[PDB]
Amino acid sequence: SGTYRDGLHMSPLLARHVVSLMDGGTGVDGLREFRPERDLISAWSREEILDDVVRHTMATGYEFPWRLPLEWPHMMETFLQGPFAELADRLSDTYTPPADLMTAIMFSEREQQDELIAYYADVHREWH
Amino acid sequence: VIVVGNGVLGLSVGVEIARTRPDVRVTLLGKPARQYGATPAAGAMLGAFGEVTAHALASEHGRKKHALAVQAQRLWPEWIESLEATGTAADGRIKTADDTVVLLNTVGHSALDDANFAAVLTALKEANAPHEEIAVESVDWIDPDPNSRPLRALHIEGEGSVDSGILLAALERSFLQAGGRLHPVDATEIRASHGRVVVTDDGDFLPAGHVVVAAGARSQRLVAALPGLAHRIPRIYDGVGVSALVDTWDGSGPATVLRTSNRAFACGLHLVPRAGGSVYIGATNAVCLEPRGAASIAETVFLFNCATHQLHRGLNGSELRKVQVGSRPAPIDGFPLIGGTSVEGLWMLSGTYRDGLHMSPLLARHVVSLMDGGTGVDGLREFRPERDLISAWSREEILDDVVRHTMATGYEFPWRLPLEWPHMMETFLQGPFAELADRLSDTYTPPADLMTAIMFSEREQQDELIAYYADVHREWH
Amino acid sequence: DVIVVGNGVLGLSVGVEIARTRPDVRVTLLGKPARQYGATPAAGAMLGAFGEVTAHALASEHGRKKHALAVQAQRLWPEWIESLEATGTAADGRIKTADDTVVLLNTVGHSALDDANFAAVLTALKEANAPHEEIAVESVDWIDPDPNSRPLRALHIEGEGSVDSGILLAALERSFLQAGGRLHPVDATEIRASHGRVEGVVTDDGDFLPAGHVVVAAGARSQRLVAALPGLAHRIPRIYDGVGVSALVDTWDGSGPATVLRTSNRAFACGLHLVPRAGGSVYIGATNAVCLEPRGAASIAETVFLFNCATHQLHRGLNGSELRKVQVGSRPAPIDGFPLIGGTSVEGLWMLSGTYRDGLHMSPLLARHVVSLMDGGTGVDGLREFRPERDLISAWSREEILDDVVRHTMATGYEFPWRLPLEWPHMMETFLQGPFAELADRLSDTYTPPADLMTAIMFSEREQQDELIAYYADVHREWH
Ligand SMILES: Cc1cc2nc3c(=O)[nH]c(=O)nc-3n(C[C@H](O)[C@H](O)[C@H](O)COP(=O)(O)OP(=O)(O)OC[C@H]3O[C@@H](n4cnc5c(N)ncnc54)[C@H](O)[C@@H]3O)c2cc1C
Ligand SMILES: Cc1cc2nc3c(=O)[nH]c(=O)nc-3n(C[C@H](O)[C@H](O)[C@H](O)COP(=O)(O)OP(=O)(O)OC[C@H]3O[C@@H](n4cnc5c(N)ncnc54)[C@H](O)[C@@H]3O)c2cc1C
Ligand SMILES: Cc1cc2nc3c(=O)[nH]c(=O)nc-3n(C[C@H](O)[C@H](O)[C@H](O)COP(=O)(O)OP(=O)(O)OC[C@H]3O[C@@H](n4cnc5c(N)ncnc54)[C@H](O)[C@@H]3O)c2cc1C
Ligand SMILES: NCC(=O)N[C@@H]1[C@H](O)[C@@H](OC(N)=O)[C@@H](CO)O[C@H]1/N=C1\N[C@@H]2[C@H](O)CNC(=O)[C@H]2N1
Ligand SMILES: NCC(=O)N[C@@H]1[C@H](O)[C@@H](OC(N)=O)[C@@H](CO)O[C@H]1/N=C1\N[C@@H]2[C@H](O)CNC(=O)[C@H]2N1
């Protein structure tokens, strides 16, 4: 599971991998990293993800595509940085959600954000 | 008597001093270039009811300003008669229209345009002013883009316009006729000693027992060099305004002023009729911490786009005669600086922002009455030039207003964007403006027009304002 | 005595060349400092050769000749500038403002113009062995476009540059005086000829100036001036006003690009370009509308369109930059789409006009051509077809022009750029064909106006259309 955009494409390879593991083999070399039972992976710095989430947020405008005064995109770029930086810091000292999930958390209810702070904390206690 | 400044205010007080005191020599300073001059860039509308906003009529200070504008309106017919009397047919007519039509369209924020249309209607009813809501199909001349068209229209009777250029010529002519002397140089410094009252930019010195400062946006910078007055006269900034003269495709023009209510950050759309197949369109407004003598591309495009879509598509193929730029004197606390000073013989007539020209006859009569030992006009006492910064609104009201006006710049464009985006911008604008207001001062909050300028200024310019606000608190509290 | 009528780039350029190569003769140049309707002072200006290439131009014999002349003109510019700057000092300023041009391809226009014209420019550069390369858009210096208006392809053309048209005019005036030329700041009212020879020029102050040579380079007024002579009303092709709007902008930070920045030519010979200037200024242009009467002022529409394209397609920083000046000049727009260069049936009467978008670029070559002809030479080979005294050229079939005028009409939509329901462009394509086909058939059995002029005629008054039907008929009777 957790194949997001390309499980269907990878299906023949992923199926062969799991069957090899079930038969006492090692399957496909690179897939060991993606063991289902693991600490949350941190593939990017908080800094990389905060740049990415602001860039992707701005991209939702250009993809529409919007038409607006030329000052406005510069205003939105600078006023988006603070709130996303604040959310990332509030969520966990160690884990940063990738951009796709961070925007969903940003626009979720306070209760759902607090539940994620608890989840991230409980995962840290289990693995640190 | 020396009048410093050759705008509508300087020349209007100059004319009234010269006429009512034939004993005294009155000299008026300022150059024909009229650098940063608001008056020559003005249409201009004799704006009283047209200037009504919900926000203005919710503060005590705003309801006073409105009352003065209504009083000023009554002086205009005899003031024009008395200025045209010193000239001939060939000098042209000061008055270009008697009536104004206010248009409501959807090319703006509902939170400004809907509220302000209702407030104008209300203020007209309260004052028993002659007006009626008319069918949009009965408004003459206009040919808007259907997607930008008005759906409601308001005819205001006896609210009109003047040619600001013919007004200036008539004031100069009337000043000379009454014995005034025009010296085409700029004041560099006001000289005072032992608390009593000009060095000019050619090096000369002119003595006087009365100095009236009406130097538009430069008025406070000139008086603030005197001892203590740096933190006792409220700062005046440049409300930079862009307008245009257009020769219409067929030489036609509307019989009335055409306008919207005031829009984001005291911008607004209007067309003022002119003689000889020309129209005036205006006007943008941006508070700048340093003066600027040239229109931006953005200001030009916005003014032209609004006029062609919301007023007449015929303006699209019409010839651009002139792009005009002037500085509305923008007082830091949002109210004019009119009257006497702690220095004997030193008077100030400035910080009139959008409507100094309209109020000129009343403001001139007020200052002359004060100079002759009178009390002048009742309601103008609150606008003493030497004062603590007025706080006409709560920090909360101003933070709601600045976010609303910021959003309005979008709806006025008008923008097209995903429907989630306006909600995102509303919530993400609140924090930064709240943070700026708290950082600037514990006591003073700049009005919205100035707050947005401060928000997008350099850190050095923000820090300088924090020092200014602190020094003003120490002087007055 | 030689009299040059006109003080634009063409008049002054031929003036300089006559004065320099004939020190024996007195050369007098007419025209006032106001330069009313003057194309030259409103120009950036680009030394446009490859940048001016369109698919449509390079599909006609007459268009491939014009291109060849523009390539020839380019080779003269380095020595021409050297020879003009040599008569001045450092403090007079540099004529050259850039050496190179970047052509940008964005989607703020019709694919049928911009895609076809980008390919045609690339092809014409390859054919002429001109130094150039397709570069990464990320490697174009200075530009900061709106992402939705950004270029996705860019073409660096080496040795295709720009001049400050104002410093060029000053350097031409200076160089003219240095070579013994005399400037008389009045306008010609009338050319006098008798027994098929030039006598001289009546000026607007009432005076009469005698001469054995008169060169007319009065821009858009050139044909109206020569047509008063016997027979010539229907023997010299009419020139109209290609009214052009440009602007000088002081950039927010005093910066400017190192190269010319431009698109290919767009709807009705409009186009977007930025020409570098000294002292924190840039030139942006340029609109184009053929007008049947002259117009001295930009429209609101022209100003907004120029500013909107520059701020979105070139640099968003121009949005907050200060407008110094809106400039208006008249491109001399010949009715048959080709210049009027050379000799006349009247001895001593020469004409140098109808250069539309690229008179300034071709000036050194056109000046050398007319001087060679005046000295009994043949001048430049390819310029014979553009004799000023001619039947109207028919460089394209009526069919080609009707396809072109509809395509350019549609392009005015895509260049805005418009947003409308997807059925609407297909409806407009089909409903535009009939009216333009009807106009072309009504105007003449033989002559078809080029697209730029046809749209102007389409939206002119019935009286102005009828006058053109009479003109075209009178020209047919004179030549056929
Ligand atoms: C719009 C879209 C476009 C896509 N395009 C591509 C593409 O172009 N290329 C590509 O490679 N992939 C594409 N994908 C899919 C991507 O590859 C996925 O990662 C992949 O399909 C996941 O497959 P899955 O079998 O894990 O999950 P699913 O396809 O979701 O199958 C899981 C199934 O289990 C069932 N189920 C749930 N709970 C239970 C239960 N308790 N007991 C039994 N059954 C249960 C569900 O009903 C469902 O049928 C796309 C997906 C979407 C949504
Ligand atoms: C775009 C625009 C539109 C407007 N529209 C309207 C309208 O519709 N209705 C309306 O009522 N009003 C309008 N106004 C004007 C508004 O009322 C102003 O508040 C008013 O014009 C201010 O007049 P003033 O004499 O105080 O200043 P100004 O008109 O600026 O005159 C001050 C003069 O002092 C000169 N000066 C500066 N320094 C010195 C010095 N050291 N010595 C001497 N002289 C000096 C300046 O060059 C200038 O000429 C408009 C203004 C602008 C810019
Ligand atoms: C907006 C715009 C942009 C341009 N951009 C470019 C560019 O990027 N690159 C380029 O190569 N070229 C450019 N051009 C110019 C183009 O090449 C023109 O074809 C060229 O300038 C024509 O030169 P001219 O000397 O024939 O005309 P003009 O410049 O019009 O000169 C004619 C002069 O004669 C004067 N005159 C008129 N009547 C009389 C009379 N009776 N007697 C005496 N004098 C008279 C006029 O006032 C005028 O000054 C541009 C032009 C415009 C309008
Ligand atoms: N790039 C040239 C161009 O677009 N030509 C147009 C063209 O012929 C038709 O429009 C489309 N879109 O095809 C046409 C429909 O009326 O209007 C044209 N535009 C004009 N003509 C006006 C006059 O010269 C005076 N005032 C202006 O501002 C000019 N604007
Ligand atoms: N009606 C006033 C207004 O919209 N104010 C803007 C406002 O403060 C912010 O933008 C929004 N939309 O809220 C802000 C973000 O930089 O820009 C403001 N506008 C400007 N500042 C520029 C400078 O004065 C010089 N050149 C221009 O062209 C001016 N335009």
Numbering used by the authors:
A (entry chain B): 364 to 491
B (entry chain D): 13 to 209, 212 to 491
C (entry chain C): 12 to 491
Sentences reproduced from the published study:
Here, we report a noncanonical FAD-dependent enzyme Orf1 that adds a glycine-derived N-formimidoyl group to glycinothricin to form the antibiotic BD-12. X-ray crystallography was used to investigate this complex enzymatic process, which showed Orf1 has two substrate-binding sites that sit 13.5 Å apart unlike canonical FAD-dependent oxidoreductases. One site could accommodate glycine and the other glycinothricin or glycylthricin. The resultant product is no longer sensitive to aminoglycoside-modifying enzymes, a strategy that antibiotic-producing species employ to counter drug resistance in competing species.
The side chains of E312 and E434 likely experience significant conformational changes upon substrate binding. Mutant E312A confirmed the necessity of changes in recognizing substrates, whereby the binding affinity versus ST-F dropped 10-fold, in addition to losing the reactivity to form 8 (Fig. 2d (ix); Supplementary Table 3). E312 another key residue collaborates with F316 to facilitate the decarboxylative reaction by introducing a repulsive electrostatic force. The fact is that the residue experiences a substrate-induced conformational change bringing the terminal carboxylate group in a short distance (3.3 Å) to the carboxylate group of the oximinoacetate moiety evidenced by mutational experiments whereby compound 6 becomes the major product in the presence of E312A (Fig. 2a (v)). As a result, E312 undergoes a substrate-induced conformational change, in which upon addition the induced decarboxylation should facilitate β-elimination. E312 not only recognizes the streptolidine base but also ushers the β-lysine to crawl into the binding site in a compact manner. In this context, E312A is able to catalyze the formation of 5 and 6 but no more 8, as opposed to F316A, which catalyzes the formation of 8, the dominant product (Fig. 2a (v), d (ix, x)).
